Design a protein around this ligand. Structure first.
Ligand code: HEC
Ligand code: HEC
Ligand code: CL
Lengths: 131, 130
């Protein structure tokens, strides 16, 4: 019942893809008409996934593509697992702050907290995700 | 606006990531129970279940898009109101699971976990090609 390396890659990819979809809804609400309840729901996804323990999905054998299952994790990620962990914690904390800002229903607060989350996604990607 | 292929990929991602978190709750219920692990996993299930995934069932997502295959049954698209009702049953079961987990109510967590799983199953039985 332990996830295989292939399953760990697919599962982490699923979490990132689903965060990204919800981030996009927050961006859309900030740029246009603001639907506070939609932003709450989206922010809760980002907070929950960022705090779900995704480091468990970076086990041995998950550095390589597995047949048709390709990873964008760079070798640098597996060489620096402690720094990756720190960047993940920065996302967890920022994402919780985004969900708390969204709970207030105030677009301005969300705008700030959303910037801090996006910066945390980008900080990790710049170092550890292939383009 | 997401393309059809992106809607398929995104809904698949949501279900896959829920499933991983469901398995963590099951492991806590069958093994050494950790309330904080259960909170984190329950929060994912509740959040994903309430994230507006019906928006991922747009036109053109009833068929495979090149290499991107869907396992949704064609009947799903003939019954979208019911699909939404079943999604809503998941959302209210999952919020109950997360509320119980948040407050440390382990009996209610155990029972809500079974109701969540039943909601997954109810939709699959009708609407997933398996
Ligand atoms: C601490 C590191 C880290 C953080 C933080 C992080 N990512 Fe990533 N991201 C990755 C890695 C590594 C991959 C490649 C995963 C793979 O292919 O195995 C990835 C891949 C992705 C992908 C590629 C498609 C996919 O589904 O895999 C998207 C989209 C994505 N991330 C979005 C996000 C968003 C949005 C956030 C912030 C809300 C985020 N990521 C935060 C490390 C991170
Ligand atoms: C209201 C309908 C509905 C509910 C509720 C639902 N599912 Fe599904 N599920 C589907 C459909 C439809 C697919 C196929 C998606 C596709 O391939 O486009 C699917 C696919 C999946 C997949 C495969 C995703 C992949 O990787 O392709 C898993 C795993 C899954 N569901 C688990 C769950 C779990 C766990 C729950 C409950 C916590 C759940 N589902 C609730 C409709 C639902
Ligand atoms: Cl009716």
């Amino acid at each position: 019942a332990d996830l295989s390396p292939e399953e760990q890659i697919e599962t982490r990819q699923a979490g990132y893809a689903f965060m990204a979809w919800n981030m996009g809804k927050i961006k859309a609400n900030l740029e246009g008409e603001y639907n506070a309840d939609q932003v709450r729901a989206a922010a809760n996804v980002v907070a929950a996934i960022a705090n779900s323990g995704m480091g468990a999905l970076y086990g041995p054998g998950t550095d390589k593509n597995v047949g048709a299952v390709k990873t964008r994790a760079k070798p640098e990620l597996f060489q620096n697992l402690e720094d990756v962990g720190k960047l993940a914690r920065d996302l967890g904390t920022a994402a919780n702050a985004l969900a708390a800002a969204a709970a207030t229903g105030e677009a301005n607060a969300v705008k700030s907290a959303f910037a801090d989350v996006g910066a945390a996604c980008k900080a990790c990607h710049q170092k550890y995700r292939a383009d």
